[PDB]
Amino acid sequence: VNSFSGYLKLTDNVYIKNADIVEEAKKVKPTVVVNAANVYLKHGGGVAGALNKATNNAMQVESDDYIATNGPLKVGGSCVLSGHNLAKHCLHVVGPNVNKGEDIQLLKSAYENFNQHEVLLAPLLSAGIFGADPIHSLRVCVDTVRTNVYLAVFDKNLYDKLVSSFL
Numbered sequence: 001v002n003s004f005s006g007y008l009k010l011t012d013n014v015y016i017k018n019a020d021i022v023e024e025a026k027k028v029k030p031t032v033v034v035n036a037a038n039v040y041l042k043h044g045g046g047v048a049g050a051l052n053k054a055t056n057n058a059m060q061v062e063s064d065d066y067i068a069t070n071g072p073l074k075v076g077g078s079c080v081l082s083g084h085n086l087a088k089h090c091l092h093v094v095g096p097n098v099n100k101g102e103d104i105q106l107l108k109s110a111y112e113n114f115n116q117h118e119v120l121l122a123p124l125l126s127a128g129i130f131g132a133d134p135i136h137s138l139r140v141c142v143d144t145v146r147t148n149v150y151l152a153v154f155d156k157n158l159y160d161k162l163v164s165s166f167l
């Protein structure tokens with residue numbers, strides 16, 4: 001039993017809720033919140049800009065030190081950093097950004113990072129400003145992630161389409 005509330009159960013391990021991941025993060029204090037990161041961990045907009053704003057820019061400060069030490073992530077890769085006031089940990093995962101021409105097949109590799117964590121609050125990778133089809137992203141998620149994933153979908157309209165079209 002865990003503290004996630006109001007989710008629709010899609011599969012044995014995937015749940016989905018129309019929710020603001022920031023607000024859901026502040027209420028649940030999940031062990032892991034996933035950020036829709038880029039390789040530079042520049043949290044300027046979309047989910048990343050919202051999560052970082054909610055941390056009063058502490059996420060960005062920590063991220064800049066991480067990059068200065070380690071260099072950029074790979075597309076499809078991830079790193080674990082602090083969750084600040086939102087979660088114990090933030091798993092920064094880089095899905096491909098279609099608006100940069102990145103290979104959508106790397107989306108499966110991106111979701112594989114989730115399997116290193118028993119339970120996660122997460123957005124749909126490569127959705128929103130990353131330019132992929134959220135329905136495809138949901139399919140890859142369900143077919144790749146084996147751990148327990150609670151997907152927060154900000155847009156109510158999108159959410160209802162994802163539910164209604166789910167196979």
Ligand SMILES: O=C(N[C@H]1c2cccc(O)c2C[C@H]1C(=O)O)c1ccc2[nH]cnc2c1
Pocket residue numbers: 020021022036045046047048050123124125126127128129130152153154155
């Ligand atoms: O842009 C957001 N979400 C999308 C996104 C963004 C970046 C990468 C992604 O893979 C996705 C999936 C989309 C979604 O889940 O709706 C988002 C969320 C909460 C917010 N609060 C204030 N502004 C917010 C913006």
